[PDB]
Design goal:
Blueprint: H1 3-13, H2 19-37, E1 65-73, E2 77-81, E3 88-93, E4 101-102, E5 105-106, H3 108-120, E6 126-128, E7 131-140, H4 155-168, E8 171-175, E9 185-188, H5 190-198, H6 216-233, H7 245-258, H8 270-287, H9 308-323
Parallel strand pairs: 1-7
Antiparallel strand pairs: 2-3, 3-9, 4-5, 6-7, 7-8, 8-9
Helix pairs in contact: 6-7, 6-8, 7-8, 8-9
Bound molecules: the ligand O=C(CO)N1CCc2[nH]c3c(Cl)c(Cl)cc(-c4cn[nH]c4)c3c2C1 and zinc ion.
Motif (KKH-loop): 237-239
Family: Belongs to the mab-21 family.
Binding site for GTP: 51, 133, 186-193
Length: 331
């Protein structure tokens, strides 16, 4: 009964106990850069983004590297859509950050340079320094941009009441450049993704008692592990470098929308539920369409982002893994 999958989840768990002391190693360094960045005039309002502040690794199989976001409050921000890219925006103001202005557009590269220099004296999203990536993120308490109006389709799964509640929380903007226009900012909903993951069932008591243990989380871990295993095996063939755990997480949220009932995620159906996630992710690869869960018109599997041969290469390897009962999972 899917004994191979649960042995993979067990092996992954046994490599996540030495971090209870290795997270304090990272939590201490963060509070230093957090406390020292407040001495500068620009970053007076920085903070640890996640409410629980638990730093989530992009790689589920690399317990050594972490990823953390620094959030700074700013006066009322106004956005301008860049070249019909539904996620990239220029930032204006409706204050200390004026030193980074390039006319009206708030400069992303100017803020990174000063962000790098302050930490240096202690692709484009984060700077690195066990390993830790640190991404800067502008917090906007305004309503979510128009391109998010038909996203977050959780109404039949987490209820329209919860959706309306999540839309009231702020959204975030990280420096990211798309050509490669060096001055745009990209939308970020990492806080919404974390809240959905830890509050994932249609029942409010999902995974709060043994009678309601679902395998939603375990399926996502298996999807993350499958991709990381394939990316490592074929690291010398360049097609798989584009793919990341965010693509797998995005496709996972779509499968949750497609399967809104908790009964469709029974613990006993781990093999069937994981197979549902592999099939849907394969469909996204073949059709070259994996839309952002919050921005439906931002296709993460578009040609401009990931080449087509890479997608059919990953399709080839995933289908090979599925047909052979996943040899990357054994031993
Ligand atoms: O490592 C990388 C790639 O550099 N990623 C992991 C972290 C992350 N977070 C993202 C958010 Cl929040 C949004 Cl909106 C979009 C994308 C995105 C993914 N592919 N193209 C855009 C991402 C990514 C991607
Ligand atoms: Zn659950």
């Amino acid at each position: 009964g899917a004994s191979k999958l649960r042995a993979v989840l067990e092996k992954l768990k046994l490599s996540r106990d030495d971090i209870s002391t290795a997270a304090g190693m990272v939590k201490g360094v963060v509070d230093h850069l957090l406390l020292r960045l407040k001495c500068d005039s620009a970053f007076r309002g920085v903070g640890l983004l996640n409410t629980g502040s638990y730093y989530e690794h992009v790689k589920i199989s690399a317990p050594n590297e972490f990823d953390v976001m620094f959030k700074l409050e700013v006066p009322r921000i106004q956005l301008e859509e860049y070249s019909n890219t539904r996620a990239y925006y220029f930032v204006k103001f409706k204050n200390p950050l004026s030193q980074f202005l390039e006319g009206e557009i708030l400069s992303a590269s100017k803020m990174l340079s000063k962000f790098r220099k302050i930490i240096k004296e202690e692709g484009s999203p984060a700077v690195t320094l066990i390993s830790v990536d640190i991404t800067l993120a502008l917090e906007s308490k305004s309503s979510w941009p128009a391109s998010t109006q038909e996203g977050l389709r959780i109404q039949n799964w987490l209820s329209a009441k919860v959706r309306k509640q999540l839309r009231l929380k702020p959204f975030y903007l990280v420096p990211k450049h798309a050509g490669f226009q060096e001055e745009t900012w990209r939308l970020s909903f990492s806080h919404i993704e974390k809240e959905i993951l830890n509050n994932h069932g249609k029942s409010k008591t999902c995974c709060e008692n043994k009678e309601e243990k679902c395998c939603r989380k375990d399926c996502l871990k298996l999807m993350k592990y499958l991709l990381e295993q394939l990316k490592e095996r074929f690291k010398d063939e360049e097609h798989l470098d584009k793919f990341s755990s965010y693509h797998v997480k995005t496709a996972f949220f779509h499968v949750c929308t497609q399967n809104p009932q908790d009964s469709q995620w029974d613990r006993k159906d781990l093999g069937l539920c994981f197979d549902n996630c592999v099939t849907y992710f394969l469909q996204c690869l073949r059709t070259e369409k994996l839309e952002n869960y919050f921005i439906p018109e931002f296709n993460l599997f578009s040609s401009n982002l990931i080449d087509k041969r890479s997608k059919e290469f990953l399709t080839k390897q995933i289908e090979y893994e599925r047909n052979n009962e996943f040899p990357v999972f054994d031993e």
